[PDB]
Amino acid sequence: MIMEIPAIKALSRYAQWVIWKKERDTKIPYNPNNGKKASSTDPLAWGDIDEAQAGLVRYGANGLGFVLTKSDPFVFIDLDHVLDENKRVKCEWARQLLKEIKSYTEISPSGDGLHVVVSGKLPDYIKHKTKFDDGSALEVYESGRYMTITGEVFDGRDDIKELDLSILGEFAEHKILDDEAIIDLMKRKGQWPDAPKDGDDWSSLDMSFANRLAFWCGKDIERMDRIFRQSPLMRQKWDRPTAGSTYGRITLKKACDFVDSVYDPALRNESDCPFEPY
Template sequence: MSGNTRGITREKALQLTMRKCEWCGTAIVYKNAQAVYCSSRCRVYAHRARNNPFAALRNEKRWVLWDTNKRPIMPSGAPASSTDPSTWSMGHVVNGHLNIGFVLGDGFACIDLDHCLVGGRPNEAASEFLKSYPKHYIEISPSGDGLHIWGTADEGPGTRRIENGLSVERYTTGRYITVTGRVFQPGNLLPL
């Protein structure tokens, strides 16, 4: 024994108190044996993603419509802006419209893969890329040949890169992304 009268070593006791965050998988060590998230941020993200990943988003005032040129517009038809919250709507306002979009920010993020579907199937580069997102909610873009991987992330500058021949755009703020409802992969809003 290592001085522990209950028959549990200090190492074993530490293992019993160390768990992984149910949202991001980070190791958590708390005296509170009921803690399941490493932070309040992860708790909020998990709460938002329960059941339907867009259910929580419908209550956000971050929705816009878009025209035939994919420019954001308000329900009135006036121009909207992905950087001006006064031009955004609640989800119930745009509900029923065909061309809707969601303005990223407040932890909501998206990865846009352009021209990666051929005949409805991901090309080789996209197939390899998607292996990193097995439980994420993924939609087919309006063009029918791209994918939107939805999730959560801290706000930061957007990036556009070619990764192994695949066009990959990552956005967390200052952009809107079209929402088609054409599910490619059911899943949740998980960290990107």
């Protein structure tokens, strides 16, 4: 019974509730009172839990949501893909976290992840998202975003606790936007490649994309390398030693000796791009 959960009762004091609908792999928040999409920073796009449960029924949404703000005391800890087919923790980093951070825990909508809600403050030196080799991930937010609420309590952790969160540094990577500006620009111009297909010459796709990187990044090799590692063409071969270097570095160096023109963001000579879009 979701309204008997103490954590739900605590969250029920706040008028920061939304409903959400499944769109592809995304979960879009919706204003629980008029059925339109909800901003995550507009307080009047939300409602209290009574308006959210009424809107859940009235529009047939997929579930409830709660918007975290920097003024409320709640921290949202998201553990992606940490459960097996029997809803038991299969990642040892997640099991260790649950042992050190005992607060309200619920199974996320996909059934293979967890949510942890704590009253506290995130440490200042950790990254928001941390990905692991087994596909699992740890995402932490305390504001600017909403969280789905399922009420499927995990191992009886039904109460939100006030806890110090400095131990989150044991699990999240530590910190010690122009790249995304270049990446999004290449996508708008149709210069962003898609994943290789079965019959493709992958290495030839690498050089086509590397040549386009040389223009849009202005022959900034370090920038070209950072962007390639988050492209659909990245693989282990990119870092395999090759002659005096790596296959990727030889690819990027070759692209600069080849490409003539260079994109200058202060001039925006997008027309100088020697390569047609994909």
